[PDB]
Design a protein around this ligand. Structure first.
Ligand code: AKG
Ligand code: AKG
Ligand code: AKG
Ligand code: AKG
Lengths: 276, 276, 276, 276
């Protein structure tokens, strides 16, 4: 009774007839993996789930990122608590693909809607696959093969740390650990083989094989193009919603329009491999 | 009974518990009027209506438009049939405010969904009001009081329409009937007094008081800014949905991602006055 | 004898030691032709000439264009009088390659400075050859082979000329006689074989093999790139100067900073062939 | 006989009939000063001078900046040596106003041409006074009173000097000692009272009173606007040339199109005050 309902041609599907708060069968797991590989972002409603059950579900689709440093559920360091009462989430109101400044950016995440404002706070997703397919041939030919630099300081500039000398040293220290690195501009999905634009406003600073000026123009083009209505969907949250997206070929945008209302989410991140 | 559920802080509400296939009470009409003034675009689901019913409901909020040349219902001259089998709708996939090239652009419209593709074909709306209020003070200050040229030919260029030296007669005649005219860049709603950005990439060509080079840069900015996620919503159609929007302070976008599948909408347009 | 002093690495050269008011020798002609093929735009100071001599000189380098109605010298329908007291030149203050909306844009022109303001009215030239060569390999790979639309209406909007029943018929006839056409984005010089960027902000409206959106970004990039200082020169005019440029691989820009002072130039235009 | 020859309406003048290898009379000093205030950038040809003579001249127009490290010139540290054999000048091929990241950017500079390549290495100057006046009134009104951040790391980013650990703590301290700071977008010349645009692509990163998105669009507009031909001049150097410009209301650009040929200039910087 596992049911997959596509939400739009470019990406997105809703799933029902499966209780992911319990161990799912092999068949169900594989049915959802296929849906992910096809639709890239999956939604389930009326699916309450605790962090332990959320981790047990996400771990079925890859290894989980362990964290004791970020806002965690004490019992499960595999599930991250996102609380607007504790952490400002304003910088999520930008198109981004998660941790693309890493050598192996996250495979994806399972997100749980715990506490929501009456309304507002939508999240959008955009398909790198659909976006890439819609580019003109000559543009696809040129970009496929090129590489781009990703740098965490684009989303975490010096001013976001502090104007104090020790805030400056912290910024230099985290920079040493996460120096700028490169990924293909057109990424081949490691499972499905589907090609996708793999730059995002959050982290992409430079198309390496173009000049600074040429790069600025192309990236501004690609940033605007890839986030067009044709390549995206918009989710209006309800409590107990669950979202499961493939971070290897999407970007997303957390609309910040509900301050100072409290919003609480739970996140489990699935580890990814090297983009090629 | 009648309930009004906001969909987003910027714009949009859903109304249910009111049967608009039958005459609505003066109180219902007034409630919906206020909802429109507040939320700018209203949605009702599971609301089947024939053309005649659609017209008397629409007529409750202003005078309806009679169009003889465009495809409409035989007996109801004021309800327009939008059928993808008959007419192509590719150029609706562009942020536009309806007929802003006229001295008195449409007040708004009532739209009914008759026949829908299995999925796809979402429509987005954007609040000129929310967009304006989100601009910096120095920008609101400079823009408020300026005027802008709206040109029919920007959506209906020569190569796209008037494709024959025989059809060109139809172009030269319309280009001669609807010359470029101007409207305030910042419009004051004629009923609520709420101020809204009143430009759209669909018809706006030039900010009159700025130079060509200046205007181009400002419009590129405003076009991007006014359609950011913060100021918009996305509606996934279901048959028998009704949409009711205020075309005096909004823009909309009809995603064309369902070709060649058939889509059929019915529209009643409400006449507006001069923007000031 | 003949002396050729390069002005800048990208383009431009001053020539001396030849009196072009008299018939030049074959060897001199060929020396100047070679300098044109190398330096693209040539300058001769202290070379007074009448229209008769200027036409005789120009004709040694290709067939001359004949235009009666356009302000010219009665004795020499080959030489055109450009007088700011008669014709507004405000529209030459934009980067353009001459008549690229024609299937055979001009080969070049020989220009003579008759009367000049005390100061101002500089003319700049840009090299399409140096600009193309400085592009990144990927960009050159992509552009080399594409085509672009050229349209005179980009520089001559109907709102610029024509209001009378005749004036409107005057425009529609011209537009009818000069439909948009295409030229290669990367032109191969039909003599030297050198490759040049062949788009200009004056006339180029669209790169054909790209979408409107993609084209728009690429042209803005190219318009800016091709006119950077690295690829251009700026001539400060003196009376009796003669300029001779290859219009097949350059753009130029006439600075209008001398109003209302009078400026009179004489121009002989050399017919060109089909760009490829 | 001190003679002043205006080169172009927007800015620039050539001065002759004065030997600046020797002391200048008060009458001359004041004439040059007035010429500086009117024309913003002054050029003298055939004026061979040595470091001592050059400092004596520049000192007549304000207090000179001392170069305490690696001088060059030993006996005259007020004169910096710019030799491409030792220093890469590629960075100067960008539109910039000198040290605007300092609270009191340089008043101006006296530059001497010691050794030049056969050709190439032109320098351009642009007038912020002429640029400001050419803006539309609405735009002049909005900008006049705003402030912009200047940051040296815009021109000198970390990846400009290497990961050599010495530079990691050495460069880190340079940013600590030169943090981002602000200046008026529209500067009032402290002597003449003439208003000028005071932003430059070199160091200006953000218009403060606007959002990042708005600032981005505006600065892109201004950067292009201020460097248009209308507002600029181009100087083709000769050995023994002297340039003397006002860095309070202009920006300049050094073309790097002569590598690897050797270029040697001597520079004397006049200290400036706080922009307002
Ligand atoms: O979108 C959400 O609500 C969570 C914040 C976010 O951007 C994410 O989890 O990646
Ligand atoms: O939403 C659609 O069906 C069409 C949207 C639109 O362009 C209109 O009918 O006003
Ligand atoms: O450049 C000139 O001197 C003005 C006329 C013009 O631009 C040209 O000759 O094409
Ligand atoms: O302009 C030059 O020739 C030297 C480099 C530069 O731009 C300067 O003097 O500031």
């Amino acid at each position: 009774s596992l049911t997959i309902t596509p939400l739009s041609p470019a990406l997105g599907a809703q799933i029902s007839g499966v209780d992911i708060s319990r161990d799912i069968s092999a068949e169900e797991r594989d049915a959802i993996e296929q849906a992910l590989l096809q639709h890239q972002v999956l939604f389930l409603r009326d699916q309450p789930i605790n962090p332990e059950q959320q981790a047990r579900f996400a771990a079925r689709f890859g290894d989980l990122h362990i964290h004791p440093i970020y806002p965690n559920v004490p019992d499960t360091p595999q599930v991250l608590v996102l609380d607007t009462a504790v952490t400002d989430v304003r910088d999520n109101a930008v198109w981004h693909t998660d941790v693309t400044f890493l050598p192996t950016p996250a495979l994806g995440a399972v997100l749980s809607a715990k506490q929501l404002p009456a309304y507002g706070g939508d999240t959008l997703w955009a398909s790198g696959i659909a976006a890439f397919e819609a580019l003109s041939a000559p543009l696809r030919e040129m970009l496929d093969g090129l590489t781009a630099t990703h740098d965490f300081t684009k989303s975490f500039p010096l001013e976001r740390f502090g104007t104090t000398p020790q805030d400056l040293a912290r910024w230099e220290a985290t920079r040493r650990n996460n120096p700028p690195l490169s990924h293909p501009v057109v990424r081949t999905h490691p499972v499905s083989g589907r090609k996708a634009l793999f730059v995002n406003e959050g982290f992409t600073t430079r198309i390496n094989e173009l000049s600074e000026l040429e790069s600025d123009a192309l990236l501004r083009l690609l940033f605007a193009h890839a986030t067009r209505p044709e390549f995206s969907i918009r989710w209006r949250w309800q409590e107990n919603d669950v979202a499961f997206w493939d971070n290897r070929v999407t970007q997303h945008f957390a609309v910040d329009d509900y301050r100072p209302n409290r919003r609480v989410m739970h996140r489990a991140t699935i580890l990814g491999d090297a983009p090629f």
